[PDB]
Amino acid sequence: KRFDSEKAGDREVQRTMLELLNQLDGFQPNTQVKVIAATNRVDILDPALLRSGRLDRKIEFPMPNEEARARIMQIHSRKMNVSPDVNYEELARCTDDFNGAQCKAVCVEAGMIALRRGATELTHEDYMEGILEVQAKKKANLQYYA
Amino acid sequence: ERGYSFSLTTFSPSGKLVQIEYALAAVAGGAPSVGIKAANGVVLATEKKQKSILYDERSVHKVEPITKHIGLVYSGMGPDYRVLVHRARKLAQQYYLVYQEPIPTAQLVQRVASVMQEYTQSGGVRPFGVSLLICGWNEGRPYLFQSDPSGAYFAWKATAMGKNYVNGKTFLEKRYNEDLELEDAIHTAILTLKESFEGQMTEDNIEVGICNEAGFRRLTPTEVKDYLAAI
Amino acid sequence: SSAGFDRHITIFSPEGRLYQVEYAFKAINQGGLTSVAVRGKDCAVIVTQKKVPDKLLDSSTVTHLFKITENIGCVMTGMTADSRSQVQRARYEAANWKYKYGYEIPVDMLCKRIADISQVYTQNAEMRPLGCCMILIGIDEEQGPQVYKCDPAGYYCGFKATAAGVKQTESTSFLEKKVKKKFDWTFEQTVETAITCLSTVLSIDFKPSEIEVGVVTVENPKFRILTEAEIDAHLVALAE
Amino acid sequence: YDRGVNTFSPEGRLFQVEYAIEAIKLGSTAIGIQTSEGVCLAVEKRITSPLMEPSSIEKIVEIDAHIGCAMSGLIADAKTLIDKARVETQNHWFTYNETMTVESVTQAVSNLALQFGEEDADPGAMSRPFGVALLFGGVDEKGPQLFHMDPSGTFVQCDARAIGSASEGAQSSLQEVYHKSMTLKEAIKSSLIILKQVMEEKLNATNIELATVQPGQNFHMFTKEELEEVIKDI
Amino acid sequence: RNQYDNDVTVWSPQGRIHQIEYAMEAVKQGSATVGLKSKTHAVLVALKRAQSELAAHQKKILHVDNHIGISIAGLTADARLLCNFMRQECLDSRFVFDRPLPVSRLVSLIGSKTQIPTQRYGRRPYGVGLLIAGYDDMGPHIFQTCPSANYFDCRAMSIGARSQSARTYLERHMSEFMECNLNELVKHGLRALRETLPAEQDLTTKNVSIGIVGKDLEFTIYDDDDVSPFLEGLEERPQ
Amino acid sequence: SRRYDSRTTIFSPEGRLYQVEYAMEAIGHAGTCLGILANDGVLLAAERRNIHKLLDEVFFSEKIYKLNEDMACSVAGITSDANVLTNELRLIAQRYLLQYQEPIPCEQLVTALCDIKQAYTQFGGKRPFGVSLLYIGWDKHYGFQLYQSDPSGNYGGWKATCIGNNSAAAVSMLKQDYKEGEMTLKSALALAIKVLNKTMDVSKLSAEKVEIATLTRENGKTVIRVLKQKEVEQLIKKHEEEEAKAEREKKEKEQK
Amino acid sequence: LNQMDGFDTLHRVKMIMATNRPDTLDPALLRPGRLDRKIHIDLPNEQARLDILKIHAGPITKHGEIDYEAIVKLSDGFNGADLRNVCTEAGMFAIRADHDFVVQEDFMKAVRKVADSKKLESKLDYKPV
Amino acid sequence: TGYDLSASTFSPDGRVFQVEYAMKAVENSSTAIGIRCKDGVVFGVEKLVLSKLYEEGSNKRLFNVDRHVGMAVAGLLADARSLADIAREEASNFRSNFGYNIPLKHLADRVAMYVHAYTLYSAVRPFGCSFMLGSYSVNDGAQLYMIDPSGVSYGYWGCAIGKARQAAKTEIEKLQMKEMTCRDIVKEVAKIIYIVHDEVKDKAFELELSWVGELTNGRHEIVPKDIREEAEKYAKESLK
Amino acid sequence: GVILYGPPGTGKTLLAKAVANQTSATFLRVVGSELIQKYLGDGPKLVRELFRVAEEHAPSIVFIDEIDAIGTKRYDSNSGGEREIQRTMLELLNQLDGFDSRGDVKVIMATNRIETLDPALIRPGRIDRKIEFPLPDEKTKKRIFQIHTSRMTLADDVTLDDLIMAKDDLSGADIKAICTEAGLMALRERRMKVTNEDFKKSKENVLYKKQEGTPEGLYL
Amino acid sequence: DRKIEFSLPDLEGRTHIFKIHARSMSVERDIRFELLARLCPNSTGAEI
Ligand SMILES: Nc1ncnc2c1ncn2[C@@H]1O[C@H](COP(=O)(O)OP(=O)(O)O)[C@@H](O)[C@H]1O
């Protein structure tokens, strides 16, 4: 976001941004170049990026809800030898506030736990121990509950 | 409700109250005013500059009376002025209910100063942003006091307040002296308000309230109209 | 040029200004509407455009022309919820005055009570300063029509003709030139000036279904809200 | 950086009661052993200087005539809890003509263990949790019962619990030497054997005080010069 | 540097209150309880836990009235406070109207009670979760309360740490819950509860408790003495 | 809410109170007052911070505040914040006179106002009272007393005091130039004039920047007097001649 | 600044310059003589958004039922370019199920999609000159 | 950054970010649709289950304030229940101290002020609920009002509140609600709900409907369960 | 590593100058006031170049005087140079012992305070010899006065024992401040060598310089 | 992908760090290290 500030670090970036905006849309329009932009925050971007031909569509990417999470683990475990008594809905129900990368890290961690005990095909408890590692829960001492 | 009840006016490490100085700087960017006590009565003058000709000048007022012999003008913020005017009126009525005598101006000044002090000290509220100028002819001798937003008060023969007040103070020290009359005090108050006013000076711009031994009187536009000519 | 908590709570800046009322003014022109009040010789008129962007929305409950008392009318600008809270507070204070002091409350005293209520909001540091505007019209015997405008900062003042909302500067710039030649300000002249002010500021030539006009006068002191037939008549009389 | 007294952790447990749990092991140790013929208590006085009179420091404070207690932590905080427990026992005796069970007085003293508040009212309500763990022992109606209370208000029945600085060491040394079928003298000897290596000072008849509650004897005995009978055997 | 997640008053840019989710994380740290019902009975079976080798197990089920019985998972002081509120409300209902309180208006009362602290300043959410079984005039009910004050009219559900296996078992063995008697229903409850445990130890008749309410049966709690008629006749763990 | 709190109760990492000291630094400038007694009669000397020419001066009062038949008080620091304290101690004295039907002793009034000042630093969350004042009085038990005070509620009896501007040199000269039990009420006034010549940087001070108020005792009256400007001028002149007298010792000796 | 007026004056040379923030420019740049007239371009009004939409919906093979008045009503604070995106997005919904002709329901649907996106970039309102 | 913490803190742009975050929490719920007609008001709520977590009728979002007033909520739950008991208390107080039934406009205004009393101070947080209020009386016709968490109440001939709101108001705009009766607008509401719901991401949808009107002679009640509610079969017939 | 701490003025650095004459290798002195930079980046570069020069030369000794000015705490983490100081100390923490610890380089650090220090510095492996500097009451104060008055005259009337007899709260910086100023009255008055009243008024004025305006009438 | 944590050892690892750090010494074969690890409850490898 361009504002009133000091130094030369921001002013060089704003110089390159104003070069980017004119060469993308405005004088000499071009069809033959298609631009794709990605970010993780949008509150920082300048409103001149949300103009006519700069950024045409604004696309959301929410966190996976239930069936997307069961779909992710099915895709990543395609190469792995999986024992055919595992139901992914129970995993997707237990795994909460995850993403695509975290559900990917569950499958890789589960396959190693079978390698630690040397078993080839997986099991349900291989996945659950992968779940407990991914959550990264610190030492608790929470034995004064319930 | 919330009920903060914590005081947010605290001492600086240099040993001063920063909010009091900020309120005094708010006062110094206010409307100009002058007050002259000269040997028969007190004259208070100020400036009403509207941003447009569509305003009604006679609707709101700035030389607001309190009793039949006590007057008040201000320099600062307008919304923070009607509140202490109403408080001073109610307090003077309580004094008249108890003691059955018109309230002397000095006691009014100490009690509004104590009100300003307890607004500074108490919890969850900001200090006031208005310097007062209280005039009155009680027991023969005229009185003119000024109370700052710190909650203190002084006594002045002739003082000025608001924007460009140090040169007005030098004007009042140089041109005026110890003994005047009422009419030439009105003349020099109009002059020292004219030292920082606009090109025109009519009764629609300036507002003058005088006091004497016959009671407090806010001047009509006719009296200020013929006073503003050739002065 | 802040002092840590200068942005958030209502306190004095080092420059002397208190910033929360200045950030609350933007709530008046955030809403996107403009309202003009014009006072003449024997009438006071209020004109406000209304926005109905969806056909399923009821068009009879959009109007900001609120009724305070049977001879005292008002209009709003800014956030609608704070405007309705001020409407209910003004109705309660008018009824309280009519119960207490026996006679009908004048317009300026109601505006003083509203301003004194709004001053405590900027005095203390625990409440939002309630960013909505106030325009009141009425008739007072041996004073004629009266029009007043209060403020979220608590500053009330009398007026001859004024506007509030988003387009205050251009409307006042046109209105000063309109009022500078003091002509015969009758009823038709006042409604023509009030309509043409918004017609020249916005340059839209509005249909009669999107303009609300409130009237008060000396011939009858009752507050009236003009229906579409008289707005039709005034708009076809305006077009020569 | 600074949060309120009622704030939950990101992992979900709490943010102030766990700090009161963390303040338990800055105090002295206290061992309570329940046996089918009586409940025995023991504590470390933790003297600092020879000029301090050792009989002033007390940890075993009686609540009712048949109920004892033992402290670990900040004694001044637990004085209010013990006074309140005395008030509840006398009120229940006055309104029901019978003695309290030790579970009921532990419940009554644990109800107000977690009642701190900032938005709350009253004439200065508690602003922080109490930093003590209390052991209660008694013979109410089912015989010998021993209870342990921690600053989260959780009370449980324990057969042989030790609290304080070396609570885990005394517990792990209490695991092997215990059984349900033992006697009171064996319990006192075993508790003193455990308390031998826990303390950083040398044991004598003035560094500890112990108390035994039995169905026969009303209050708890074994003051000074009665401790010397079992000290010389150790 | 974290911001927005130190008080219940502050919202989030994503539009949620993180303190309520922290209270959910608190309530999922307790031991697993299972509550289920038939056409004529309501049984909740809870698993006790041991804080030490020789310390006794903390009980979970505790009776509220002649027909309402609640379970618990989470804290204990707030549990006693809420349970005292249920007891006082049931006493006022039996004192004024001389009738049993229905469980639906009781949990509506506790929802209105628990929603007040999660709106004001400096008041924490209640970190407890209840499973409420009750036989009022029209059918038995088993209800589940949350620290978000969203009560759900469940039919067979489990709460606590590692309750997903119990939920999947109750899903796959749902339909044959109303046609069976109490003896088979209790065995179904223990079969649902034993999936929470790891496959090394079992229900050793000292860490379980069973509470039953019914049409003509008083709300009874069995722990370590009347439990043993229910543990016999149970199949071994398939591992 | 809670982040807006100014935290005027907690100690500092060295363990000493952190807000009262800023009030004491505020007392440390903006004013000058002192009091002297060693026999009958006790005097107060004060300095006018504002000597602007447009002041009326007809207020017939100064920092010297009368509060009883047999007392006086002089304030220092914030002038706005001293009216509350003077009214409170006047109320305390009148409540004692209503209760016991005798005039209040000095110790009880000073301790009562110091407890009231301490109550704000103990709790309440408000800012402390930024006023340190100084009492003179007469009593049945101990005669003429002079009492100092602090914003923290600390107090103490004194015979030569220090409350105002830069005055460590004034404390040193009060130590060096003081007599014990021989101070009749004509040498103490000259001592006060000699001190206030040196504390203030204005050389050859006039009767506009000095205020002298004496509490003496008549035959059962306890006359509290504020000295007019007609006698303060020649009281200053009687010390102004003393410098020229003292410079003559180095003039008639250097002759060989 | 120097070659704008300087010593050698210009003849038949006109310079046009445009920006988004006029407040951050130099006062010596913005003084008259070098920039004689400042031209303000604002957000379009109701009839201004109407004939912009008439131009952009020109080469669209629409079915002859389209009413632009309802479309312009649910667009306040739009730029002069989001209406071009509205005309673009209506053909995208025509591309869905290859409906060829553009129906006014797609215009009402595409307007609500664009006004959904116009909530994460605002508060521009820069001071004139 | 720091303006979005408390409700009593104005942004530099003049906004109050806490009620905006409340609206963000509002739009994550499921869709609730209310259509006004010439003879009554029909509600419709798309209830969502996960595996069961419910019986038939559990987590009900159709409340009942009074005999003639219907309430359908969409937002963060347990505040809907609090507002339901609040509106019940206002209705009972009006019946006790004024005799006759509470009008819908007055009740919506009262609950709107109760909602607005929470977005002023810093102690309390704004609500996360946006409900509906529909009623039918012989002397007042059929009315429907919608209240947002900011505290603004407007009348509507048809509106939708929830996640799929912008994809549902167009389907309401397709039909002409000024002329149909209740018996076809229930199946139109079911068709709108079936169209607007996505089955790829949730697949656990279930309708619930409601009724005020002359068919339910001025009383609020649920559509008669297994009798009727074949509008789901009609909407499955309108799958394309 | 050796760290020297104490009350402000006791022996701190002084002792450090006295050890830099009996040493055999070269001695490098740096000051913590120098260890800030207004340019973002020259901070850790100067620390790195300081130890690189010292390592290649000899078995040298690096003395970071006033190291407590930078490495005090890290809990603030607020934007600006106040967090850049935390960044410029982390390189010093890594270059002290973070990978392949350098041979024959001996560090010595002088602080004024203890508790406002980063505990990752306080742990062993970087500094071990924690040295405490107390203020001597009277015994070495005779020898400090013996040293400071050695290279000057002294008369029979002036004796220094009574000037320190009742006082037990001075420091070695103040004693030199006494002795330098007590020679300054004799030069400014063109008087004799030393008088007893030269020492009397030097003690009073140095007390005014050390303790001037601390607001403690209430004894905490 | 892994968050490997460290902490204040145990009781046994202090004895192991003693046996691997103090093995390069000229000490008679009579020192017991488990008592020395008992006497220092909470320590790092750097302290050893
Ligand atoms: N025991 C002593 N012998 C001689 N001089 C000393 C002694 N103690 C302190 N000093 C003097 O005090 C001064 C302060 O030394 P030091 O504490 O290292 O400096 P700083 O106070 O600036 O850190 C030195 O200049 C030294 O001459």
Side-chain angles (χ1 to χ4, degrees), chain B residues 3 54-55 59 80 82 125-126, chain C residues 119 123-126 154 158 160:
Chain B
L54 48 69
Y55 282 75
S59 67
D80 280 40
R82 291 176 280 108
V125 304
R126 75 162 158 82
Chain C
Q119 196 268 342
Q123 178 68 75
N124 289 337
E126 74 198 86
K160 288 196 275 287

Side-chain angles (χ1 to χ4, degrees), chain I residues 4 7-11 13-17 29 63 65-66 110-112 133 135-136 140-141 143-145 147-148 171-177 210:
Chain I
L4 323 171
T10 306
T13 71
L14 177 63
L15 197 297
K17 314 317 291 300
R29 199 196 147 214
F63 174 55
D65 206 318
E66 220 63 86
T111 171
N112 181 39
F133 271 49
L135 295 174
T140 59
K141 191 154 308 172
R143 299 278 78 74
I144 293 185
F145 265 114
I147 288 152
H148 292 189
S171 55
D174 307 329
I175 299 164
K176 172 66 56 177
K210 185 76 153 207

Side-chain angles (χ1 to χ4, degrees), chain E residues 41-61:
Chain E
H41 275 296
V43 175
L44 56 98
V45 47
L47 176 92
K48 298 181 283 159
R49 93 196 310 184
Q51 209 209 1
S52 158
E53 171 55 57
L54 295 174
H57 289 54
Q58 188 123 33
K59 51 185 320 300
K60 294 308 223 60
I61 320 172

Side-chain angles (χ1 to χ4, degrees), chain B residues 1-4 8 19 22-23 25-26 54-57 59-61 64 77-83 86 89 119 123-129, chain C residues 3 9-18 39 112 115-116 119 122-126 146 148 153-162 172 175-176 179-180:
Chain B
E1 78 106 11
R2 172 59 180 135
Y4 261 15
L8 68 166
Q19 294 300 320
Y22 297 157
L54 48 69
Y55 282 75
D56 205 342
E57 297 93 357
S59 67
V60 175
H61 278 311
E64 211 80 25
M77 321 192 328
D80 280 40
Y81 162 73
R82 291 176 280 108
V83 164
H86 169 81
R89 284 226 207 81
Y119 252 111
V125 304
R126 75 162 158 82
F128 273 135
Chain C
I9 303 301
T10 319
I11 61 171
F12 285 108
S13 77
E15 297 118 300
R17 71 171 65 199
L18 60 102
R39 175 197 89 190
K112 276 186 70 169
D116 264 336
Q119 196 268 342
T122 199
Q123 178 68 75
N124 289 337
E126 74 198 86
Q146 302 287 62
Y148 284 99
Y155 167 74
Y156 94 106
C157 204
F159 281 100
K160 288 196 275 287
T162 175
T172 39
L175 213 72
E176 282 161 353
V179 69
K180 197 58 76 172

Side-chain angles (χ1 to χ4, degrees), chain G residues 62-69 71 102-105 107:
Chain G
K62 54 182 83 63
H63 182 197
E65 293 177 350
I66 322 287
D67 179 29
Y68 301 151
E69 190 39 64
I71 291 310
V102 182
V103 179
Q104 197 260 4
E105 329 162 24
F107 270 109

